[PDB]
Design a protein around this ligand. Sequence first.
Ligand SMILES: CCCCCC(=O)O
Length: 133
Amino acid sequence: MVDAFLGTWKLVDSKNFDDYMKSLGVGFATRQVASMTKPTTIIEKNGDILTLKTHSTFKNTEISFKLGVEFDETTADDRKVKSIVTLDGGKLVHLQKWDGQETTLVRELIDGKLILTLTHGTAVCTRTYEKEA
Ligand SMILES: CCCCCC(=O)O
């Protein structure tokens, strides 16, 4: 199920992150810092509890969740959202809801790389992560 996602991942490419951040209403000064940042994502499991850490020189987040169980999340850009993470077609789909809006964060393994697709409104961002061993 989730075991191929587990580990430490480092960003190696990013397309259209600015467009996604603009769509969410992130201010120009935070978008500048975010365009140069190369986060590390750590995904860990303990039984049926996942933990997802995102580390960087700018901002750090951590969430723990069970698949298929809604949780409260405060995002890096300070949205208060209702979240759920599920396995769909082998992808890890994270849906965030707030104020009648949605965004999806979809993680898929392709050729040993982690591809993160971020959709909000018309904005689509693809991030590519490589595994640190
Ligand atoms: C608004 C949060 C963006 C997360 C982007 C990433 O994990 O690469």
